[PDB]
Design a protein around this ligand. Structure first.
Ligand SMILES: Nc1ncnc2c1ncn2[C@@H]1O[C@H](COP(=O)(O)OP(=O)(O)O)[C@@H](O)[C@H]1O
Ligand code: ALF
Ligand SMILES: [Mg+2]
Length: 864
């Protein structure tokens, strides 16, 4: 049965003496192995109240002024702007030509009569950009300008930011006067009365803590993606409208049978908004190879065979085609591979586009982030497509920093065709500029939750009928356009109808944390009140996981309460590891590791076609053999280069193969997490950065304890290397080390320790684990474990699949010490300002854990 050979490990007598002394000081039990609804408050607009911050103003102004005076001021200012601004006149002329204007008055009537109204219409017809302004202008011109307050919940950060900027531009002003936005890392707030605040749904859910006192309209945009946050918000607003009859809620959808939504809200009006127009032609893989005369490069086929023999060691719809097509067409179609994307095919497509000499920017729905930057660097390398003359390739996503959003959104002269590389965030979303050409690869990266309770996996899966229809409709927008769908006709015939609602394929622990943070009641009842309740077993699994490891005020009853790990914008496990790092004084390293582990961006840029990092990107990890350590060192010295001259910052980014966007994302997330810990009560003095000297070969207390807390925070992602690129994950499941990690090599390379912890598992072609870090057996025994047992021949069983050789009393001592760590977390949470001045027994526990989590602490008497 290929029994795993136990890893030899011993500790010095002084260490075990410290263990028994600390377990006697703590006096923990040892073994000889482990022992309602509050309807969020709402109130009409009231003087001396700031709606967005939910607190009384009490400042120099807005104190002795009634709402009516402000309404009169707003009305007079609006008339002045109408009668004095020519730009405003031109923008009004432009707004009066949209289809929404033809229904404008009608729309208002519904909002003035029914508390909830759904607005169904085509994307790009002017719903999010026009409805809020219509409501606000109606309220201002009606003499009630100060009585209006409009939240607009956009689905993603980039959508909210871009739509807020566009709305501000349409009113000939700047952000923060009457239109603002509030997304993660970035909040620009408008004036207290008569303003529009574009905020993402999660930001609104967090703002719900203090209540929506003073909000008159809430506009949930893009309800048809059916993400879990939108469903939470829909339930919340349903109860809010049921209790408060004066609140106005407007839901917006594009392509769905809105009958279900109408039935959900007790039969609410659904207004059908006329579709502007614009035709689109759809050509498939068959027609593409026919009119481009593509020759599938057999040399690249041999390369693909060589690079795919890996998975081969341990039904295709590309082979099916109708007889109307030529023999060469079907032969080349068969030669192509469905799973991978042929970049030579994309260059043939771009050749066809340039040959058509029809102007207009093109946009491509690339599968995923890695593929987006791979195509980025490939196109930048080519000559005809990639030079700054007549062409430029620009990426779009939510996680990219704001710096590139400005340059992609802003228009360019001479018509350089603006090749946009986007994820699926551009179908029912911002719509950017004019589009005439839509190239869809029919692939999308999705967090494919394999039901169960844990082991979050990610996979690139085929899109759906509705997504493809939306992407085809995204072609017509400035000139009749064309849609090149890169798949066979049989593949489209085999695509699923609609993608499943997100609630059925996401964990619900954060959902329940947010539910109980706002005092909404029992999780089961609240989830049963949703549109489509999630499967019950998922609810019990999430609740039992939350009732398991706690860094909160949670307990064991129907009202356990909850604080922290929910207001922290990170998964509860990583927040728990953050708090533990704040206890040990290594909060900075843990924060940056969490920021890198919660982001899908890659730390290292790989050239066009490789299997690993050749020498210099591997040199950063050095003797640690980990991506987290190399990531940390790269981030510090990148910060150094950025603090000094920007030129060498960029030059270094290119020279060591690091990505500026990735470093900026991890840096911003690290500072946000450190701040949100600061306001939680943890002093700054334990968050001082510790420089990581990778050159030191051996003992390093801060780095070793950081890897230990990583083992704690990434449970149950622990794997054992066997040979070459093969590792075993839980239940002894085979997996291959990701080619991007530093632990991958084509030579017969052996590691000092075989235990690794990995961030995510990308199932693009096979089970592949990325974000790898090698950890000693003691770290796995302490932190990266949950089940400890004694097997035959005095062999310790860890997680029922890991074999260890150790004295049973020592393993029992560590197992009893784990509840001591839990109680330390609870004590630190009780008084966050007293975490480095603890009781003497807890100080001893921290000291012994620090001395025990050392890299070389488990090699006593072993040459290794
Ligand atoms: N952030 C932006 N910057 C510049 N132009 C935009 C922006 N957002 C949308 N547009 C353009 O303005 C037009 C109005 O679209 P919009 O009403 O925002 O679409 P929807 O309301 O369906 O999201 C669109 O055709 C789009 O090309
Ligand atoms: F109004 Al939309 F996508 F339909 F922003
Ligand atoms: Mg838009």
């Amino acid at each position: 049965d290929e029994q795993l050979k136990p890893y030899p490990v011993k500790l010095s007598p002084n260490l075990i003496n410290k263990i028994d002394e600390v377990i006697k000081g703590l006096d923990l039990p040892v073994v000889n192995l482990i022992v309602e609804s509050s309807v969020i408050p709402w109130a009409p607009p009231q003087a001396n109240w700031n709606t967005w911050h939910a607190c009384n103003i009490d400042e120099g102004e807005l104190a002795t002024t009634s709402i009516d005076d402000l309404s009169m001021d707003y009305e007079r200012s609006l008339r002045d702007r109408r009668q004095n601004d020519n730009e405003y006149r031109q923008f009004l002329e432009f707004r009066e030509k949209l289809p929404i204007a033809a229904m404008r008055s009608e729309i208002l009537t519904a909002i003035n009569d029914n508390p909830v109204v759904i607005i169904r219409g085509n994307t790009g017809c002017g719903k999010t950009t026009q409805i809020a302004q219509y409501i606000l202008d109606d309220y201002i011109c009606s003499g009630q300008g100060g009585y209006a307050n409009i939240y607009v919940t956009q689905p993603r950060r980039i959508s909210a930011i871009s739509v807020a900027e566009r709305v501000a531009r349409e009113r000939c002003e700047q952000l923060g006067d009457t239109v603002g936005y509030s997304v993660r890392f970035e909040s620009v707030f408008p004036r207290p009365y008569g303003a529009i605040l574009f905020c993402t749904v999660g930001v609104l859910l967090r703002k719900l803590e203090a209540g929506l006192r003073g909000v008159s309209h809430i506009i949930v945009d893009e309800i048809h993606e059916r993400d879990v946050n939108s469903d939470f918000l829909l339930v919340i607003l349903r109860d809010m409208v049921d209790t408060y009859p004066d609140l106005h809620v407007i839901l917006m959808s594009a392509t769905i049978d809105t009958t279900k939504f109408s039935k959900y809200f007790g039969i609410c009006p659904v207004l059908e908004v006329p579709g502007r127009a614009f035709p689109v032609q759809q050509f498939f893989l068959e027609d593409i190879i026919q009119m481009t005369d593509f020759v599938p490069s057999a040399e690249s086929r041999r390369k693909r065979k060589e690079v795919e023999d890996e998975e081969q060691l341990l039904i295709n719809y590309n082979k099916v085609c109708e007889d109307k097509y030529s023999q060469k067409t079907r032969n080349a179609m068969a030669m192509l591979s469905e799973s991978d994307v042929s970049f030579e095919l994309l260059e043939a497509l771009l050749m066809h586009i340039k040959s058509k000499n029809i102007p207009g920017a093109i946009l491509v729905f690339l599968p995923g982030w890695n593929l987006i930057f791979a195509l980025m660097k490939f196109l930048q390398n080519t000559n005809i497509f990639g030079d700054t003359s007549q062409y430029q390739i620009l990426p779009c996503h939510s996680q990219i920093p704001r710096d590139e959003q400005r340059k992609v959104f802003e228009p360019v002269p001479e018509g350089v065709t603006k090749i946009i590389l986007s994820t699926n965030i551009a179908e029912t979303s911002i719509t950017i500029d004019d589009i005439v050409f839509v190239i869809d690869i029919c692939k999308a990266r999705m967090k494919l939750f394999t039901s169960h309770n844990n082991l979050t996996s990610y996979a690139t899966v085929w899109a759906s009928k509705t997504n493809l229809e939306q992407r085809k409709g995204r072609a017509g927008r400035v000139r009749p356009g064309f849609c090149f769908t890169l798949c066979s006709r049989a593949r489209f015939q085999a695509l699923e109808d609609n993608l499943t609602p997100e609630m059925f394929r996401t964990p619900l622990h954060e959902m329940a944390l947010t539910i109980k943070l706002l005092r909404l009641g029992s999780i089961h009842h609240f989830l049963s009140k949703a549109l489509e309740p999630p499967p019950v077993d998922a609810v019990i699994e999430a609740e039992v996981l939350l009732r398991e490891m706690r860094c909160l005020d949670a307990n064991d009853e129907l009202t356990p309460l909850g604080r922290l790990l929910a207001r922290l914008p990170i998964e509860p496990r990583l927040g728990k590891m953050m708090v533990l790092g704040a206890v040990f004084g290594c909060a900075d390293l843990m924060a940056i590791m969490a920021s890198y582990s919660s982001t899908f961006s890659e730390v290292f840029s790989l050239d066009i076609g490789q299997r690993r990092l050749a020498n210099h990107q591997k040199a950063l990890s050095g003797t640690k053999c980990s991506d987290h350590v190399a990531m940390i060192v790269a981030s510090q010295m990148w910060r150094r280069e950025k603090q000094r001259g920007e030129h060498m910052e960029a030059r270094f980014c290119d020279w060591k193969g690091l990505q500026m966007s990735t470093m900026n994302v991890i840096w911003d997330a690290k500072q946000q997490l450190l701040d949100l810990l600061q306001q939680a009560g943890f002093p700054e003095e334990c968050m001082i950065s510790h420089e990581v000297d990778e050159r030191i070969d051996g003992d390093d207390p801060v780095l070793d304890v950081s890897l230990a807390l990583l083992c704690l925070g990434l449970y149950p992602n622990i794997c054992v290397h066997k040979e070459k690129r093969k590792v075993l994950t839980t239940e002894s499941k085979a997996a291959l080390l990701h080619k991007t990690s530093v632990n991958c090599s084509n030579l017969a390379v052996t590691f000092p320790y075989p235990f690794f912890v990995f961030g995510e598992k990308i199932r693009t072609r096979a089970v592949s684990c990325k974000q790898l870090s090698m950890v000693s057996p003691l770290q796995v025994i302490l932190f990266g474990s949950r089940k400890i047992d004694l097997a035959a021949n005095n062999i310790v069983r860890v997680d029922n699949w890991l074999n260890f050789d150790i004295e049973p009393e020592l393993a029992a001592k560590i197992g009893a010490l784990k509840p001591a760590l839990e109680d330390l977390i609870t004590v630190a949470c009780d008084n966050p300002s007293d975490i480095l001045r603890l009781e003497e027994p807890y100080a001893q526990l921290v000291k012994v854990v620090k001395d025990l989590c050392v890299k070389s602490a488990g090699d006593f008497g072993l040459q290794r």
